[PDB]
Structures are given as C-alpha cells and as structure tokens.
Amino acid sequence: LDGMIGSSAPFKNFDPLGFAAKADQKTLNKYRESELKHGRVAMLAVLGWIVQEFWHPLYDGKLSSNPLKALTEVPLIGWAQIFVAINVIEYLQNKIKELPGYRPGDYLGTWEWVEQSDEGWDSYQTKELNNGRLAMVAIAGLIVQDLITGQAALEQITAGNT
C-alpha cells in the first residue's frame, strides 16, 4: 500500500483491511519478506505436489503418489537433512539481511547493480509476487482438498470429484 513493487491492474495497492496504512517502514519490510517467502515456498510446494503425483522416481518407486501420505513415508532421516538445509539457507538469509542497503525480499543483492530501477525490473518483481500469491492460494486449496476428499490433484480431477 505504498510505492512498493507488487501493485497490479486488478486491485492496485490491495490493502482492503488497512494492514499497511498504519504500519511503519520496518513492519512493511517484514510483511514483504513474509509474502515473498510464502510465495516462493508455495510455488515450490505446488510444483512438487503435481510432479510427485505423476512422477516419483526416487525411493525406488513406493512413497505413495498422494501427498500428505508420502509426508509420513520419507525415512525421517531424509526429513532431518531437508530441515537442516532449509535452516542453513535461512541462517545465510539472516546474515544477508544485515548487509548494507538490504531490501526486504532481495537475497541476490540486486540493489548493488539496480540503482534507479526500470519498469521492466519492477514488472518482473511484480510477476514473481503475483505468481507467488497464486501459488499460495493454489497450495492452500490443494492441501484442503486432499484433506477433505482424500484424493490428490490429478486424481480428483481425473475421476471428476469437482
């Protein structure tokens, strides 16, 4: 709800509940960090959901193609390694956050090269944000549908449980 990147045509500066009208710059940076992290994690989660459903080469097959079921089938020592890798990545991100000129979601340090941003750079950042938002909605829907129905995405669609 500022001159921040992420304002698109359907709803420009979409803050209907006024979360940003009262927040300071630090809280807004925190909000942008949370939104970008959620969007990236959700894009990965949606892609993994679908691909796992129609392709699970690892673990010598097995590891039932329905997600939320393979969640309880991974050896639980591979879960620990994924957890530790995510933790090390976020430790590195925390270290990045104290670098001078840091921008909320910018872990590549594009502020080093991008002074006086263009419209293409802002448009690409907005594209990433919008894809992340769509993936957040999609992954929430995926998890809820798999919980209530018990079938996965391409399985529920194939049968016709819509």
Partner: protein, 171 residues
C-alpha cells in the same frame, strides 16, 4: 537494468561484478566460511577447516577403498580412517612447506604501515611489499593454521568414523 558491471568501478581489472562474484548471497556465504569468518584466530580457522575436511575425507576412502565391505566391517572403517589421517598428514606437510617458503612476517597489518611511514630502504619483500594484511599471511599465523588443520583433521576423521559406525550399526 544491467547485472554485470566493472568491479569496484575499475574497468581495467581482470574481474567483473557479476551476480555471482558480488551478490549478497555470495558475500554472506563466504563471510560465514572459516577462511573468512570474522573473529577467528588462525588456529581456529585451521581447526574448523581440518575438522570439516577430515570429516568428508574419511567418506570416499572407507566407501570405495581396497578393503570395502557391503556390510559394516571394523577393518574397513579402520582402513578408511588411517587413509584419511595420512592424507591429512600429507596436506599438513604441504601447508607447512608452503608457509615456510611463502611468508617472512610475525605481525602483519603493521609492517606495511611502518614502511609506508618510516621508509623501507632495505632489501624489500619483507619490510616493503607484503601481499595481504590478514593474520593468515604471517609465518606465525600460517604455522598455527597448519597446526589447527592437522589437529582438527584428526578429530573430525575420528568423529566421522564414530558416526559411520553408529549409522551402520544402529540403523
């Protein structure tokens, strides 16, 4: 926008500021590594490097050595551990001779200033010149670095052997 620019505004260096050389991720990741982590004595840097290196060095020797075993064998683990320790010894010998022939300094970040201020009209290359201002760039610093590498390599190899035995036995 352009994501490749001359390094530090010098178009004549043999280097570029790409999204890999000068990215915030690269900065933080290299600044958390033992070789560049702030607040570490050269002995501590050597100890951490040796620990990590012995830890991942025992792996290939134990797994693919001349005395492998598809099951767990104490002889295979001992062979891999001894090979890793001897390789660490060879690396420590290389470090020692490299430091012996490279530096002649016992306290850096000062001698450079002394010869930039109080003149250096001598045989040079010890008073003047002096490449690098790190504590690793001294005779004393590199000696402690090699000592730490060697001790940490032994400790890390032993720790990795213990972990391998535990994983092969209790899993």
């Amino acid at each position: 926008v352009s994501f490749i620019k001359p390094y530090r505004q010098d178009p004549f260096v043999g280097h570029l500021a790409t999204p890999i050389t000068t990215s915030a991720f690269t900065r933080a990741y290299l600044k958390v590594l033992p070789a560049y982590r702030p607040g570490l004595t050269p002995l501590s840097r050597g100890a951490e490097i040796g620990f990590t290196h012995g830890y991942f060095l025992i792996g290939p020797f134990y797994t693919y050595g001349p005395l492998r075993s598809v099951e767990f064998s104490l002889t295979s683990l001992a062979a891999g551990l001894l090979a890793a320790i001897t390789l660490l010894l060879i690396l420590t010998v290389g470090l020692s001779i490299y430091g012996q022939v490279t530096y002649d300094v016992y306290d850096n970040a000062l001698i450079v200033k002394l010869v930039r201020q109080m003149v250096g009209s001598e045989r040079t290359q010890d008073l003047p010149q002096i490449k690098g201002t790190s504590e690793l760039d001294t005779v004393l610093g590199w000696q402690k670095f090699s000592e730490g590498f060697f001790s940490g390599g032994l400790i890390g190899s032993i720790v990795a052997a213990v972990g391998i035995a535990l994983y092969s036995t209790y899993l």
